[PDB]
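Appendix B: complex inputs.
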Amino acid sequence: MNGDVAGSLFTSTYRNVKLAGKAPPAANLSGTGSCFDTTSLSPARAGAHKALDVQKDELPVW
Amino acid sequence: FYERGDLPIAVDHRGSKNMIAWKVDIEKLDYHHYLPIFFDGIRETQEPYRFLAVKGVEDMLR
Amino acid sequence: MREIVHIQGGQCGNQIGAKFWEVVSDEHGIDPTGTYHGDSDLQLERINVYFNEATGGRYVPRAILMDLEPGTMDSVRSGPYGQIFRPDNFVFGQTGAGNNWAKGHYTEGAELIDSVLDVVRKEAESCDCLQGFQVCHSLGGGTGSGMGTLLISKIREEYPDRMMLTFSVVPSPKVSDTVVEPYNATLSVHQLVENADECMVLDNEALYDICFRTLKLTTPTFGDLNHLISAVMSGITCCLRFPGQLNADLRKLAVNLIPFPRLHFFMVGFTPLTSRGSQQYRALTVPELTQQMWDAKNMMCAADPRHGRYLTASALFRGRMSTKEVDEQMLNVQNKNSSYFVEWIPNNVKSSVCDIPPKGLKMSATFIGNSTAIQEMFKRVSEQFTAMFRRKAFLHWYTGEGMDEMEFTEAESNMNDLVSEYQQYQ
Amino acid sequence: MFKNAFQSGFLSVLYSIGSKPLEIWDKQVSNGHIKRITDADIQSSVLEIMGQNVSTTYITCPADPNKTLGIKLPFLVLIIKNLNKYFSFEVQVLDDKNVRRRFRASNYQSTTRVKPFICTMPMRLDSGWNQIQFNLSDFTRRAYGTNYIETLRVQVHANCRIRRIYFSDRLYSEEELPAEFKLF
Amino acid sequence: REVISIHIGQAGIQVGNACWELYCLEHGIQPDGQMPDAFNTFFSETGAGKHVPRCIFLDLEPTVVDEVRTGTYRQLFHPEQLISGKEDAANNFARGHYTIGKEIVDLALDRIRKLADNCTGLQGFLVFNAVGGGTGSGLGSLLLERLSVDYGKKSKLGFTVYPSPQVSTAVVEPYNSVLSTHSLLEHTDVAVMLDNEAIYDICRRSLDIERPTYTNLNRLIAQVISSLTASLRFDGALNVDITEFQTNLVPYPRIHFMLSSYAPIISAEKAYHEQLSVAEITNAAFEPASMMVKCDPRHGKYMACCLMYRGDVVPKDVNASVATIKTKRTIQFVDWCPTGFKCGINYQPPTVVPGGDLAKVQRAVCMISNSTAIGEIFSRLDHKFDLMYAKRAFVHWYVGEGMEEGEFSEAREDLAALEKDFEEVGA
Amino acid sequence: AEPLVLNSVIGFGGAIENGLIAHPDGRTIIYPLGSTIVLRDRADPRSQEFLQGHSDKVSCLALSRSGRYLASGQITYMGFTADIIIWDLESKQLIHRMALHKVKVQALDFSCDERFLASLGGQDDNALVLWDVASGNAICGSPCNTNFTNCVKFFNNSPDKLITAGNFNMNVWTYDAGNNKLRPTDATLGTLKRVFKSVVVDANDEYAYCGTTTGDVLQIALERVLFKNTGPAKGNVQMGVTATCEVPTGDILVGGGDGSLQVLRTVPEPSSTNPKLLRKMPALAGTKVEGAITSIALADMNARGFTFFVGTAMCNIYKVTYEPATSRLKEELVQTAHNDKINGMAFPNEYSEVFATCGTGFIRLWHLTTCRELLRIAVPNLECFCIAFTTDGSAILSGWSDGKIRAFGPQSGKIIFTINDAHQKAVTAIASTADSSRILSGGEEGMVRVWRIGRTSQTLEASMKDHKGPVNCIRIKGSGDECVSASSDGSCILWDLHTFKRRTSLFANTFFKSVVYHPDESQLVTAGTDRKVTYWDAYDGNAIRIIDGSDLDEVNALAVDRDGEALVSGGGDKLVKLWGYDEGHCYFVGVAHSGAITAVGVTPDKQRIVSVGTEGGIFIWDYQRP
Amino acid sequence: MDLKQQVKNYTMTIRNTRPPTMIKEQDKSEFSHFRALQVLANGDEVPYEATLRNVIHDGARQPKLPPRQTQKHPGYIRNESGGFF
Ligand SMILES: Nc1nc2c(ncn2[C@@H]2O[C@H](COP(=O)(O)OP(=O)(O)OP(=O)(O)O)[C@@H](O)[C@H]2O)c(=O)[nH]1
Ligand SMILES: Nc1nc2c(ncn2[C@@H]2O[C@H](COP(=O)(O)OP(=O)(O)O)[C@@H](O)[C@H]2O)c(=O)[nH]1
Ligand SMILES: [Mg+2]
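Resulting structure:
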């Protein structure tokens, strides 16, 4: 229950990246290109969990 | 009970034989809860406690 | 058992606090990573005062860092003994007040004071028996003066029964950094006189003068200035953290040094202070420490103690000594300089002894004097304030942020009457 | 412990405002958690015990299971907050026949069973913060012909916000209670 | 015959931290609490091979208390004896008497109660404190009043340390002293004045130590206490208990302030220098350079005097010495007391504590007298009190704590009446 | 006059940074002693020739890559220039002595081509000077920084240098023959303001590794002097990093502030699929070591593993083996010594191969034949003074600076009793009587006390306070009646036990230091600060004869053979004198004890002489007829 | 008076009931050390660590400081009459 949900965004991000010192997760920046231009949309789905484990030969035999 | 400190007794420590300073008046004291305690305490022979037990028994009986 | 909560505000406050925590960690023998590694057992028994115990044999400081710029936090985490601070005590803004008391006390305060108050209160119940608060800051800046004053107001509103130390550095016309120094200082001291239980007045000019004359150093860097102030900061509280032949409480010092509720502006010194070229030609004895301590050139304020009268004074010693030599030396200093003390308060000297001298020294002392010479510095600031105010210079950036003229008028009146009582009792 | 203590009219065994509130208590947590957080109602630090299984997570009064504290005070008072979940607490007492009775007050049972060793009782709590006073002497008198002598341990279970559990000797009113023991 | 000692404040606790090792050294008790009947007056033998003292050290700061807890005598004092509060009185009489006193004195007195019940032939009380501080003044007076309302009849030897006229280590100590004395009058029966500058001078001249600390002061105070309690502890040719002072040293219900002195304070080489006899030590026990409170008795007249002796002392020489002193005119008595001397003798000589400088003397004398030099001392303290009170300095701390200027006014007028009584009686 | 053969030696200085170093060829170790450097055969503990000539304590060592040239620097009194001394390890002679640095020389470094030396000196000097090896000349110098600089190291091509200041900076200095000047370039730290202690350079000059006092390794890419990834990922070490060494592989062996060894991988690597590199992971968590690490040296090159010699602040030299295949460090301590000045030593009665030597806070029992320390007792923070066995082997008495006398047991080191306060300050002399029931003590107050010890108690008898100065020695006669006390009033007092009185008082102009009974109790031999030994008649007290041996400085050490023919004496100088008793004749030895000798003794079996000085050194000699 | 203090008194009461301990801390053991000394006396091939053992006692409580000087040079200060204290 916070008066402003976005009331901690910048401070939390800065504390995580610098103050606490833990490595910040830097991923999903592929295909965004530069600024001032539209980002190329990837056809991948964010919500979908496309794990699809492939144990082709490491599966033990009964 | 005396070690617990629920007995309202102090020693006068007078020049004559010492009397018992009673924190509360003995008249309204609950005899049912106190008389068996002191009557059981008559048995012991240690110096600081036997005098207290005997004097308390005497005072209640009087 | 007795607990002090430290708060750092502004650039000067944060740097001085970092140096102070380095000094305290060295004195208690804990490494810059947070693990105790000392030899004597005197250190363990009084680490609850400045260090809450943490899992893994690590001790974290009981201080709250407060500012508005990322640069100060980056510098604090950069320096040595910067890894011991708890990362969640960094109450932190984004923009910076920029030498504006309005920006520090009315605009950014309205959204930072709630968070800083929550952290301070939570750290307050983190300790069982509170003793007091100590805040280290400036009186000329924006993020250190205004926000510090607002935090003091809220604290003293919530906890009306605890000691209050405000290590505040004050401007001097010779060493002048910014331009609205009188504007910030007048309002800050206006609130401090009605709010703070005592104020530790410091200034850069006196420290520079001491470093030039006594220490005979070539480049008196900010590190040296902060180290001297840090030595004072540890000396004033050594009594609670170590046993001695005459233990003195912080409230004990407050009662001995405050005869009237508003005459609570003290001036500080430290001894011994000698150059390396002369360290070998000097002994270590109470008479020489006392003469250096009472020398006017060992004082850390731009106010000559000989231009006024000592209402009260106190000396806190560290090291193995004799109370006989201590109190006879105080007798001598009171008798020879009899006219310099007030006449209607006998025994103007309080003395305390502690059994632990600081690391690197055989013996130390700390002077704290409630004299009436501070009125000179206050008049020095007030005349600048009146000169700026008669023309309303710079006043529009204060009036355009919610403020008006009445608070300035009241501050000027308050400072005038306050220096009037200093002069009257002088 | 506590056998040589003074045991005046008031005696606290756990206070939520302190450096180490849980020094004599022995936390035993499984599928749950314990915290010290600031409540949004009384603006102070209180301890939270939460657990999926109320019978698993609890805190006992004496750390050593064999070694038992000694308190002669009749009344035991808790200051808790109702989280609208299952909550229970247990106390051991000693009678003059030198046997150990047990009193367990629970939120999730209906009948009041009386056994030779355990008396299980129902409790009904109000909405927010409330103080419960237990009156060990009267409960011992009602549950058995015995009378109260001594308390051997106390243990509170999951789903509770707790602060200032203590002992007392009288039915103190709110106005006559000392300040640090009040609710506001 | 047993007497119980209680210590309040830093000064009282350290005086006790001297007296107790002196006592166990006298009785041959190792610090852990066992020997390898005379001890019964101080140490109670409990269980088997364990002796515990009859005292309570109590103070609000924990520093001195747990320094004692972790010091040399950890096993001697029972852990329940050492009471410790949380924060100082901060040289505030009101803070020490009304804020933390209401919380600590109840436990303190209900502990001394169990001490008393364990005791059987309790002779009386004796308190160790300095009125300059906050705790030893405020809560000392509070505990005094409560003990008086509890027992009342029994004697209360209060060995109180007052501030030196010109040596000072505080600021509001005149306030603390007058406020404490206002209660010390009508509750204590025998109050013994002690100073610090006088002891500094004593150890400077006689004990020829150039840099004396509090340790030597406490050691010699302990020596005085042991010398005045040796009559109960051991047997002599003429013994007196605590109750002879109560009748021979208090001629009037309110004039009870006794000055103390001790002889011979001799170092190691001066022991071989000077000849130890009775006449010269009795003479040395009377000049101003050998009394524990810095004041000049020649301005006053003696009312009563008591001489305890330890060691190889026969009544012949003390009788001759008292006769010579009475014939001497440099010291003058008062008309209301033709027989102003009370002698007492004990066979055991004083002991030597390794670590002190006092040498093994075959005999010693302790002097306790009543005079008016206390009258000038109280007048001086009253003057330096009213000087500061004229400007209402430091009164805001008291009024904030909860007191007012009322009790200040009554304390001032009560001390004025006390001086009136001294100047009337000395006539 | 003839020199005395020097048998074994125990002792080295572990406080010196990077002091203990191995010769690059063959079997040779070298470490700094008090004010001399000591060579040792790495194979067998046969002490090699010592190299004297230093005015005061040596503080830094350096060795050429070829191992032919050695450089040593010392610390001198304030105002007197410290001198760097150069030695040839093939022909052991002084080659160059250069005195330029004001107070002390911080560090020295030799070049890859063994042509230049870098000298950094002074807490206050802070001037870097470059010398040449061909002649005792100085090429060029420059002030380093406002803050003091700690260490200097060369590259493997050596026109360049790198130094790291103590407080807050780091520089790379290049040397050019065009201007004969040193051009510095400061390091580019992002924000770090760390305090550097030790530095090491790679085998190919790409990076340099410096240990901060914050407790982490710090990597600097050279030729641009840029900051890169920091040290251990698994937190920092318990105190500041104190020692660093370069494995011949791509690893760094780092020794932290609390005896902690770690092997850190040097190759960078990116983690979490980001441009940011992860911290240097520890490829091996080495076990703890008792002493604080101060020196690491790569001793041997073996295809199965790498051997390193590690010095400690507690003066404990360790040999550690590191196996890259199976990551594990194996440690064996090879020698131990005293970290601080030692004073006083004891011999068991008619028993030879036990030494009781005590230093600050430490009692140590040593074995004579093999020099291996058998037992140690440690009190946290105290200064030790006179210690002595009882005439029975039951107890070892020890004085302490706080005024307490403590008695310990020989086996298991159990304390049997202690006196809570024997003297008002430090006690200086303790002696035991033949009956083992009485003990004599003497402190700095100037009083002598006597204590009777019963099976359950310790009682104090009459105490005599004749002396006005510190009591320096106490000696009891075969029967307990007679005991002599020598103090600093210029007087020696003879006491009586049956009645605690004094018989006579021997007097001299200067302070008496040592007094020894002659066998059969015929006479007394005393030594003091008059530089004169004096014979005294034991019965009445009279000066028989005065010998002016060693008039240069004071003498405080005396012992006499069991029969009474030989008399061994110390002094304020560095030589040990061996006189005949009846005649004044010399059989002394000169080269030993870089520090002033403080005590001496002769083994009861008349085979060996043991001497202990103001530095942590025990020198086992060989006895011979005078 | 307080809960922490009461627990401390209980712990210290137990610590006074227990008999005093001569050794605060021990390394290795006396028995193993005796075997190490025995094999050393019998022959060779004994490591240094085997023979070396240390025991730590309570010792001084205060930190280590250089001793005080109580009396200065005798020619500087004197008492009222004369002498050297
Ligand atoms: N004789 C003697 N007096 C002492 C000693 N220590 C303190 N005092 C005296 O005590 C007076 C002040 O009271 P303190 O004992 O210091 O402290 P307190 O009585 O507990 O009062 P607070 O400090 O407010 O808690 C000083 O004026 C000293 O003269 C001591 O060791 N020996
Ligand atoms: N002693 C000391 N004083 C400093 C330091 N940094 C800044 N100051 C002083 O602080 C004053 C300016 O305060 P400022 O930084 O603007 O306060 P802020 O805006 O609230 O952070 C200057 O006059 C400086 O003399 C420091 O590191 N040490
Ligand atoms: Mg006090």
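The longest strand of chain B covers residues 9-11.
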